[PDB]
Design a protein around this ligand. Sequence first.
Ligand SMILES: O=c1ccn([C@H]2C[C@H](O)[C@@H](CO)O2)c(=O)[nH]1
Ligand SMILES: O=c1cc[nH]c(=O)[nH]1
Lengths: 243, 245
Amino acid sequence: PADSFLKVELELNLKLSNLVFQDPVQYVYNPLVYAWAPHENYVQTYCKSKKEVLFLGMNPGPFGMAQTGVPFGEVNHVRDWLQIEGPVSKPEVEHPKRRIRGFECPQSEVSGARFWSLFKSLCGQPETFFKHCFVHNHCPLIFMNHSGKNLTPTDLPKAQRDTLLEICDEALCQAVRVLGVKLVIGVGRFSEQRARKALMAEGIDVTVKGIMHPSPRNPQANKGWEGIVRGQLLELGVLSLLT
Amino acid sequence: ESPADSFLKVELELNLKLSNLVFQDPVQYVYNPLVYAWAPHENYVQTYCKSKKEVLFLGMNPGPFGMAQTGVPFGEVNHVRDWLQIEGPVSKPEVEHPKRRIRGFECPQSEVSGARFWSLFKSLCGQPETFFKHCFVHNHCPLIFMNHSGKNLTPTDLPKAQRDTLLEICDEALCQAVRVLGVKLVIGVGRFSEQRARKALMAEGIDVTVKGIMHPSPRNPQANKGWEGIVRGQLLELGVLSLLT
DNA sequence: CCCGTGAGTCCG
DNA sequence: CGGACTACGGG
Ligand SMILES: O=c1ccn([C@H]2C[C@H](O)[C@@H](CO)O2)c(=O)[nH]1
Ligand SMILES: O=c1cc[nH]c(=O)[nH]1
């Protein structure tokens, strides 16, 4: 599935490279272009067989995946526990306050540190997490307004969001079919809900569940995110598979 | 001789003057199927405007599921494809609202106005050659407008400033189209086109009759109870049934 | 982020 | 002379 999975991402990059954003959207980065190499290293190293479980995020945050090309790709955990590195280039148009520095980005993505710290504690080594699991985002683009502020797919005006999310809904169907996934875990309500509508519409044979999003913008994530999600994972019965 | 070429250059020149307008405010999207649906359009004019005409039917502007998809006036997909037998590649506008995508001849929707319009002529004439022997069909304005959520805006829903130069420019191209075609009689489909055409042709002193038929729009309840029956009677009264065997 | 409250569009 | 569906601010 590594090669097939990367083909789906390349075909999705092609359809997205034709969209045009505006309005409050002023910058659009695709790390699956300028951080293709560590992305493709992550997929070749960790996507070696079919998967039972897909964790699905919404999109890149500015300091993790936007820098490293790896879902929830906070720099220290990507460098040190996943052991993925690779050259990173730059978007053609950078916001000054959001330049791409790759594996030299000084900021920690809180969402990504939390997410990989959890699976690091639970699984020990990355091979144990990836025996049956994989992690991916619904949307590979990141968007800023004039002042460098992040607009998630949800903050896009409706006219710009429906366009984009229908194209990613279709790439998501293709991803789930190539990986053989039986269980999609939406990270946050938006991915959970989006994946469920999209997959049910194609009648793919797959169950869609959810865990809480780690984001620090989520006030409930700021006490005990790890403890709440260890309890959600136990309920979905995936701890089993993570040992 | 044959007006096809000249009709196209009229529309090509109107396309030019229009490409220069900036729209505002409530208007967020503007399409022009004469650019991205040029090929079926040009195929319809060449196939059916080979000779000079007695009557021009005139509509206001493309609807989102008829002419906006097929480039043919009142251009509901099934009738254009199966009755007029007009095909061509259709590409997309520069900027599309997600509720108003252009799918060309793959558009699954059947525009009610357009399906009504051509189904009348199909029943009345049999074959398209009979209807086009002396008639043709065109719109006053080739553009389509949408607000921020994809809702259609008619040319008259436009802020007066934009509305007036747009119509004035269309009026001018309409007077040429009428000259190029040779028509004795313009029938506006719906009130706006009838009135606008009367005001455009009288104001440049063209010696042409302007009449009217009810518009087939399902927004009008009288059209939903028996449009075809009303318009057959209106066409009788105008003496045009003889032209359409 | 997650949810609640509620306004634009369709009902051809 | 409503029903369903699907922006934005505060927790
Ligand atoms: O008893 C009544 C009658 C009417 N209406 C409102 C709703 C309806 O749309 C309109 C009259 O039919 O006024 C009510 O709320 N209650
Ligand atoms: O890659 C990422 C990072 C943050 N949040 C997500 O949903 N996915």
